[model samples]
Structure formats: structure tokens, C-alpha cells
Target chain A: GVCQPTEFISRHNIEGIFTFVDHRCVATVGYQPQELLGKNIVEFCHPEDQQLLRDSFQQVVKLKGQVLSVMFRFRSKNQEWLWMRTSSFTFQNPYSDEIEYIICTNTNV
Target chain B: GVCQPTEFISRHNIEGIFTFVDHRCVATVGYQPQELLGKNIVEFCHPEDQQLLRDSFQQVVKLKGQVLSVMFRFRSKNQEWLWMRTSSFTFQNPYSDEIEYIICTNTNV
Candidate 1:
């Protein structure tokens, strides 16, 4: 069962966790679905904090598929900052063995 | 002005691109805003591809804040997969000199 009072859930591609599909997460920030697909993950982050996110991501890769927990801030559609926490892990694609995806669930902090 | 027809736009802390506020991106995948806040980026991805995304994030840090583009698959609320692309970049916060944000825009491919 999913935990954390999930306000949003999404799957990302390895190249940057770009949204292939977004649940109600977009609307919360005040945007439409057409606005988010095919974007890189870092574009929506604070530059100062990007280093920490980057390091954690590298750790996950170095560990070769470890579940990681991290904390950060997110910008709402209105441009307000919100604190967030996330648990991440990697999984192989069932349709194509060559591809993998990252599964993430988020909660407000 | 925002680009890419922006179905969704968001800001992320360095640790993960968890939602601080969603603007319809969550609904696209069939979840609510509360469901996604405070989650790690990798929890929503396909495992095999996690490494690719991880590497790209590291590259951004190594480059010390460069715009990057990436592609990947996302899981929808209905458990379906969708392909997406994204453009990402980093910026410093106005109120806090110590913090930075990663801004990202997404589009479906």
C-alpha cells in the first residue's frame, strides 16, 4: 500500500525524471498536462539545492538500485515555495528490458 | 515567458523534484496534489532507466548549473506509460542567497 498521504505520484525516465505521466500534481501548482511532459527534472529546482539532489542521485546509481529518501523544496504554479520529502527507487520496464524507470511518491513536510 | 505548451511547470529542491504545488500535472496521471508532495524522484521511474537520469542530474551539478534536456517514460494514474521530454535549468532564490531552485518544463512527445 502507498504511504505518506500522497498528494501526487509520478514515474520518471532515467534521463531526468521528465514526466511521462503526472497525476493531480500539476493542477496543484496551477498548470495543465500539456505544459509538463518532456521536461528535465532539474529545471524546476533551486540551484543552490541542486547540488544535494545531484549527489543523492549519484549515490543511488553508485549503489546500483538502492531506495533513497531525500528532502527538498518545490515551486508551486503560483511561484510559492513548498517543502517536500520523497522516497525513490528504480525498477525495470516490463515491456522493454532495455529501459528502466524511477518510481516516486511525495508528501508535504 | 514559459515555453513548450507547458502542461506542467515546477520547482524542485536539490534532493528531488517533489511537488511543492502541482498545476494539473498530477491530475494527468490520476492522482491528487497531496499524493505527490514530499516524495523522491526515483520512486516513480522504471528501474532500468534510473541510471540514465541519475547521470544527467550529476552532469548538471558538474557543469555548475547548465540547461539540460532529457526524455523518459512516466506511469499514469491508470497504470499506463506515457513518453515525455523536459528542459531543466537552475537559478538562485531571491530571498535566500544560500538556496537555488531547478526549474523544469515538460511536453509530451
Candidate 2:
């Protein structure tokens, strides 16, 4: 079933933000990379979780550090609502001078 | 939603049992009568439940009556499986020699 993948947890990325992309999650959720490329991760988050997500977003930007074990809700492509837990980490790109990205691996429960 | 009908629980039946023909349950599950017509309901039962189901089957046959509050698992046409509870009672047909049908209303939880 598309809902459960056998080998590993699938993940996708909000690029150019400070996180390394994990393609497996993207595949599990049946998304194409282009669909998520360069999009703000917060756009799909639940309204109530915006504050908490923004806080982490800021910390990643400030220290270029990783945020772990965050739980939140997301809306799927089919508009089905889900509860998800994610761990995100940041990476800085010296060459591009960009915030890089915050890549979060999420599981819908 | 097709998954959860607002009005009532959806169901389909195996015929000649003491059960009412509730078209409401059938519609919810996306089943048409021709698909289930004259089929033996017990054919779709879980192997582990065969004995318990047989007991109920015998009871229904012996009393020529309805059996109520019975629970078991059934395999769907698509091979999806579910748990269901049924209640049935018998009625003698005054017009003909045939035993009055036992109509059972079932709920899948």
C-alpha cells in the first residue's frame, strides 16, 4: 500500500533552507521533487502549529543547528489530514551563502 | 465520505439468513446486489472464526429463528478484511411452507 513502505521511512525536502534533502520520504507520500522544490515547509502546516514551527525555523537559521523530534500536523495532496512527527537538521552552504535548508524526516501516524 | 457514511453503518449480506435487507449498509460499502446475490455469507469468513460461526449457523438453522449479537470477521470482494457483529431473528411464513427468512442487521466496527 502507498500508506506503508516496506524498507524505510520516506521523506522530502523544502530546499534552499539549510537541510539536506531525503528523497525516500517524498516517494512514500507519492510526490515529485519539483512539487516540493523551493517551497516553504511551513505552508502545509496546521495553523495552530505555526508558532512552534516558526520557532524551530528561526533557531535553525540563527545557529545553523539541527532541530529534532518535532510533532505536528500536515495536509496531504488528497486533502487528508494527518499527524506527523519530524526531526530536522540544518546545513550551511559556504559557497552559496544561503541558509541552506532544514530537512525534516516526517512520519504520519 | 465513502469511508464513513453520516447516516448509518454500511453492510452487505449472504442470503437466506434471518436478516433484513438494509440497502443503506450496502450503498455505504459500494456494493451492488448482483455481486452478493445468493452467495454463502460464511464463505468469506476468517478461518479462525469458522467454529464460532458454525455454532451460530446451526443455531439459526435449528430454531429457524434469528440470531442476535454475533461478531466475526469477513473478507471483502477486494480481499480487504473487516470485523462485523450481527443480530438475527426468525419469522415463519404463513403463506408458504418455506421457513420465514431470518433477517439479521449487522454492524462492522
Candidate 3:
């Protein structure tokens, strides 16, 4: 979410690095949008859940614009692994047909 | 929502002009992200609801980062004014402390 709101909306590159997030993310994750920008999301996932997130993301990419639901554990500012569920979809550049960003909604489960 | 998900996350400036939106915006509004990108949201608002939306946005700007929920009607591709409720907040640049973006979550009411 460029202008991300209380709901955790975010955009990421095909590689899963954050390009933008709602500023309110700090309330839930203790990291500012800038802190996660250009950083791989996997770096913030629980070690055991890391692969699951990655695997799901890759599948979403392959599925193109189909909606994918994923539940993952993320590292939070409180030193706890927060469970988050997301509804994700792909966005491809209109002309290039190349996947541009993976738009995501991060919800507390 | 940068990687705006299916939830219709979008980013706008203090003037209520969209800078970025999740491509999924098309599903709801019948406009591509680029189509609305750089456009003032007021232009697509219901005439009667326009001023209310603007007034609400101004308050959110002054408040900064406070959760402000406002309901407005947005124009959709179907030539109908679609009702949407939004949770919006402001993000100030950390260095300058100047409001950078007004991020929003657009939900069907």
C-alpha cells in the first residue's frame, strides 16, 4: 500500500522485496515502511516458516493474477512471531506483461 | 497498498491524488492502476459526496497518522457511484516531518 493504512497493504517486487507498505505497519510489526523497503520479506519470516512463504510466493507468481491466500509467521518488534494471513495477487506491467509487483494484504489472524 | 492486494489499498498525496494503486483496482473500479494514477480522487467522487470527502481528507492531513474512517462513493467503470469506506492515515517523511503520502484502505461498505 503506497499510502498504506491501518490495514497492512503492501507492494513488493517479484523477488519479494518491499517497495512500499502502510506506515501503520509500525504498529503491528515495529518497522517503518522504509525499514522494509528494498528488503526481502523472507528475512523477516520465522526460520521454519521461511520456506513455506517462499514456496507460496513463487507459486503465486506462476499463477499470475490469481488470488492466493497464505498464512505465515513473521518476526515482530515484540520478539514474537506474529501470525499473518494474506491475500495476494500479481500485477504485470501493461505493456511488458512482466510481473511488476505482488500486491498483498496483511491481516492478523 | 503498494503491492495493493485484493483489498483495494491505494496511496495518494495530501491533495487526494493517487500516486499508486494495486492493479486489482480494475476489478472493482474498471480502471487500471495507471489509469487512475496521478488522478485526483475527487474527480471520480459522487458530486454530493465530493465535498465531504475533501473535508474529511483535510482533517486527516492535519491530524496525521490518526485512524480516520470516511465513507464515500467512488465512480466505477460501470457508470455507477460505488460506495466505499476507507481507513486513511498520513505518513510524514522521517527526515523532514512533512506529510509524504496519505495511504488508504478502500473497502466496500
Candidate 4:
């Protein structure tokens, strides 16, 4: 079962996901929603891969709402490093001028 | 007058700073607060330097709100690269458990 079409889908604020999570997201990372909600996305990434994630994120912002595709390693619950690819874009909430969200779709690689 | 005791003081969310800036920070980076506020801190950094910042930031969160220090290069408004050192800590806003801010004090090197 590779990715299964909806392996991971999440919406992240500047810090990380604060909303809903796909079950596959939890299964892939080995964490419950309560444990991961409100946590920074980088918290689950491999230390060496965290920088790349940050760099990719900054690049997306620098591009001014452009889509960014990045591949990196995430640390699973069993301490295994899983390769993951993410496509992200910034969505400014139309209702609030001050609110913005980074929507990310992830797939295991 | 090196650093002048109060060079750069900023509070950042998971995304980056959304608050005030010291005049020295403007002078040091050649950008007004209006230009820097609401921008990701990494946006002011050299592409090669962004990863280190992301790594340091994750380290702080993993440490459960401990302080972390990082040194890197920042891109000034004039496009010149400047060396910078930042000491950062996470502060959970007492008003809301959902809000966490990363407070950073920076100095030129």
C-alpha cells in the first residue's frame, strides 16, 4: 500500500498543522492527532532534514505564493526515516487579511 | 558603537516575526520595520544560511521551550551579506495555549 491516493493531506500555519489530519498522516508518522496537532511540522522531521524543509519553505514564501515541491526525510514513530515528498502553497484567507495558510500534500517516496 | 546593547529584538511566530523592530535592527539590515514585520526571518537570510536557522529553531522546539543560539548570514536590504548571531527561545502565550512565539535577540558579528 504505497500512499493510497490520500496518504497525507494537511494545512499548516506559519508554525505547522493546526487543523485536521488524514488517518494516513497519523499512520505514516505514528502519532495520534491529539499528540501532533498544534505542533511544528519540523518536530517530526529528521534533524539533518529539518534544514532542507525550512529552506524549501522559505523559498516558497520568497516566491510570493508560488508552489514548492520538496523531498525530505521524516522520522516515524519506530525511529525509521521515511522519505517524503511535499507540494506546498500559501493560501491567504480571504475573510481575514492577516491570516494565511500553507497547504501541503504529502506522499511517501 | 558595536551592537549598541540593543541591536535587534523581535518576536516570531512559527512563521516568523509579526511585531516591532529596534531602530538598530533597521540600521543594521537597511530595512524599515514596515518592510520586515510580518516577514519570515529566513527571508532576510542568505539562501545558504537558511538551513542553519531552521535547524536551530527545531532544536529549540524539541527541547521543550529551551533556548537555542545560532550564528548565520543575513541579507541586508542593499543585498550585502552580514554575519549575525541570534539567541532564541519559545514563549507560549499565556492567554491562549494554542499560541507559541519564538523570541529572538540578535547581534552583529
The pairs that clash in candidate 4 are none
What global local distance difference test value does model 2 have? 0.48
Candidate 4, A1-109: lDDT as tens digits:
0112223556677656556454445566676556667878888788888887887667655554456677788777778888888766565443463436675656678
| Tens digit of per-residue lDDT, candidate 2, span B1-108 | 012221111122324322222233343333543444455667657888777666665565565533334677867555666777654434444357355455444456
Lowest summed lDDT across 10 adjacent residues in model 4 chain B is found at B1-10
Q: Compute the lDDT of residue A82 as modeled in candidate 3.
A: 85
Candidate 3: residue B84 Cα off by (Å): 1.1
| Cα lDDT for residue A35, candidate 4 | 68
Model 4 agreement with the true structure over B1-109: per-residue lDDT tens digits: 0112224557677656546454346666787667878888888888887898888767666554456678889888888888987766665443464436676667678
Error of 1 at B13 (Å): 1.8
- Candidate with top TM-score is 3
Which candidate gets the maximum lDDT versus the true structure? 3
Candidate 3, after superposition: displacement of residue A67 in Å? 3.3
Error of 1 at A71 (Å): 38
Off by over 4 Å in 4: A1-109, B1-6, B94-99
Every candidate's lDDT: 0.54, 0.48, 0.78, 0.65
Candidate 3 lDDT tens digits, A30-54: 8878888889889988888887788
Query: What digit string (tens of lDDT, one per residue) describes model 1 on residues B26-63?
Result: 54455554566686555655676577556655655554
Error of 1 at A50 (Å): 38
Q: What class would a CAPRI assessor give candidate 2's docking?
A: incorrect
